[PDB]
Amino acid sequence: GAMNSSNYAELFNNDIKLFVDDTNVYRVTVHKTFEGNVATKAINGCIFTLNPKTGHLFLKIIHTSVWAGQKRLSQLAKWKTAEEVSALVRSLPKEEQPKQIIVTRKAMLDPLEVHMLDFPNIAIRPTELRLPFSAAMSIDKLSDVVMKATEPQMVLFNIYDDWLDRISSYTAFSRLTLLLRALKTNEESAKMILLSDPTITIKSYHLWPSFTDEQWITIESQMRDLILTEYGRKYNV
Amino acid sequence: MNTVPFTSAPIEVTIGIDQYSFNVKENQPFHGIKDIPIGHVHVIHFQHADNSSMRYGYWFDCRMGNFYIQYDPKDGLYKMMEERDGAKFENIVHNFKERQMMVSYPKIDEDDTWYNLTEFVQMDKIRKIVRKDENQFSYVDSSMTTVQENELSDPAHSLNYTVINFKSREAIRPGHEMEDFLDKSYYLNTVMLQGIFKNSSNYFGELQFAFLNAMFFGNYGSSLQWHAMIELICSSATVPKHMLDKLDEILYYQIKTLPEQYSDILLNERVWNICLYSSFQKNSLHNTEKIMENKYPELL
Numbered sequence: 221g222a223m224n225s226s227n228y229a230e231l232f233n234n235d236i237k238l239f240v241d242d243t244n245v246y247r248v249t250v251h252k253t254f255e256g257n258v259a260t261k262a263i264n265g266c267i268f269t270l271n272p273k274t275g276h277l278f279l280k281i282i283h284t285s286v287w288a289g290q291k292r293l294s295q296l297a298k299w300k301t302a303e304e305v306s307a308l309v310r311s312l313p314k315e316e317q318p319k320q321i322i323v324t325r326k327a328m329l330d331p332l333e334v335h336m337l338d339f340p341n342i343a344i345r346p347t348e349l350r351l352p353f354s355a356a357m358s359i360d361k362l363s364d365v366v367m368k369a370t371e372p373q374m375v376l377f378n379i380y381d382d383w384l385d386r387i388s389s390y391t392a393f394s395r396l397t398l399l400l401r402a403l404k405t406n407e408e409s410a411k412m413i414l415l416s417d418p419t420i421t422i423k424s425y426h427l428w429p430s431f432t433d434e435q436w437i438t439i440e441s442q443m444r445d446l447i448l449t450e451y452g453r454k455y456n457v
Numbered sequence: 458m459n460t461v462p463f464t465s466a467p468i469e470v471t472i473g474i475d476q477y478s479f480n481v482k483e484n485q486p487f488h489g490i491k492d493i494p495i496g497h498v499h500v501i502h503f504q505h506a507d508n509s510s511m512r513y514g515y516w517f518d519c520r521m522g523n524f525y526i527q528y529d530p531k532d533g534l535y536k537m538m539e540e541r542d543g544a545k546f547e548n549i550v551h552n553f554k555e556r557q558m559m560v561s562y563p564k565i566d567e568d569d570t571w572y573n574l575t576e577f578v579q580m581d582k583i584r585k586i587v588r589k590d591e592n593q594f595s596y597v598d599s600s601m602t603t604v605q606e607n608e609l610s611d612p613a614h615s616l617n618y619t620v621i622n623f624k625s626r627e628a629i630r631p632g633h634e635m636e637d638f639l640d641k642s643y644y645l646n647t648v649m650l651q652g653i654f655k656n657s658s659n660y661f662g663e664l665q666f667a668f669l670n671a672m673f674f675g676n677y678g679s680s681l682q683w684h685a686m687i688e689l690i691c692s693s694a695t696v697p698k699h700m701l702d703k704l705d706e707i708l709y710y711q712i713k714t715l716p717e718q719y720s721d722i723l724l725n726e727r728v729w730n731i732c733l734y735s736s737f738q739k740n741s742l743h744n745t746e747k748i749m750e751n752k753y754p755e756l757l
């Protein structure tokens with residue numbers, strides 16, 4: 221059933237599972253027309269499919285051409301997501317296919333379930349966690365490959381960089397969700413925290429800066445501050 | 458006009474004959490029901506005064522044999538039986554009629570309710586849903602589960618309704634996932650009508666039989682089946698126009714017959730609101746929507 225605080229360490233066991241987030245699949249700018257009506261213009265999107273144990277990210281880029289001539293795009297986006305996840309699973313060797321897929325929004329359950337009817341042994345689950353994966357497009361290198369794509373494309377990342385050499389996947393996921401929660405609450409301050417020090421760089425093959433263990437504790441502390449702050453600034457406390 | 462005699466009435470029981478019901482007292486001189494209209498299936502059904510647990514009954518068609526009821530004190534219920542000796546039967550029935558020991562099937566001349574509820578119901582199809590080949594009549598009770606319920610346990614005693622499942626490979630064509638889930642016309646017209654039921658009459662017959670088992674016996678799996686067969690039509694964008702018109706008439710008489718006190722348990726809020734107000738056919742069920750809105754506006 222639903223994934224929640226109670227069964228949270230299940231994420232880090234040795235049963236292969238994937239989070240699927242569809243919040244950046246169908247993206248638009250809203251604008252005025254010459255006649256003073258409103259219109260949308262789609263921009264490239266992405267499916268965020270993540271193994272929380274290993275950090276492996278299957279970023280399926282959604283090119284705007286997939287929406288040409290289509291109706292009810294918000295509904296289509298959920299089905300397109302489910303089509304792409306099912307294709308991803310079928311492309312993986314049997315021993316790499318997940319035993320569960322956790323969707324971050326309940327509206328993805330029926331689309332994914334129908335597309336996965338051929339895999340009755342893969343459990344499709346919701347979650348009560350409010351995960352911040354929508355902020356994936358605040359990670360500069362992911363935003364860059366999505367916006368530059370001229371055609372449909374799948375790009376593979378490790379969203380943990382090399383962290384697993386030094387920390388557990390529980391700790392790495394906690395760091396990731398803290399970073400993403402911060403970027404979602406105040407993107408500018410979060411990015412300032414991460415880059416302020418010119419001497420800490422991002423390796424070419426990495427997404428985040430090369431912090432020492434001590435600097436991650438400082439960083440992590442600065443992100444908590446940010447989030448608690450904004451939570452006052454927001455609610456005035 | 459046909460007759461179903463009773464050997465006796467040794468236990469106090471409420472007896473139903475289609476939508477009609479009457480109370481028989483323990484050892485009351487009751488010997489059956491006469492003037493039963495020919496041309497229709499019928500259902501005789503019982504509730505013991507002591508144990509209202511277990512409403513049970515028998516579907517039959519008097520054209521198919523001479524049937525009677527006899528209480529079994531071992532199995533503890535009123536049993537239907539066939540009498541093969543036609544002269545013993547006529548003689549039995551004539552004596553009971555002469556002594557006026559029978560209730561008359563109490564149909565009003567104006568009244569087409571039973572026809573309208575059983576229009577497409579056929580004994581031969583009932584006997585394929587309720588499998589007991591040695592008898593010409595079919596036993597049903599409150600507790601019997603359906604094949605589909607049994608997949609989610611005695612197969613001999615199940616209701617073999619046609620399995621309908623909207624999230625199934627039968628329902629969803631590879632590569633048409635979104636299309637077939639959002640518009641079930643493929644599943645209705647090709648898989649079920651052309652492939653399984655053959656025609657809409659057989660589909661409507663199972664739909665009507667499921668409702669009647671749901672209403673008279675409180676049979677939960679029957680209610681599930683009735684709502685699934687409604688929802689499959691309402692969720693189809695492409696439905697023959699004669700089918701929609703007939704469905705509206707079918708549902709209308711079911712809702713009108715539906716006693717108000719059983720509505721809370723027999724009507725699925727989600728299916729009805731979806732069917733009358735969201736589905737492709739939201740504007741195709743004028744009579745049903747009118748009676749639903751005037752009789753059960755709370756459900757909506």
Ligand SMILES: COc1cccc(CNC2CCCC2)c1O
Binds near residue numbers: 474
């Ligand atoms: C009016 O149509 C009905 C609908 C549900 C139940 C009954 C009564 N059942 C009786 C028959 C046996 C003892 C209880 C109905 O008459």
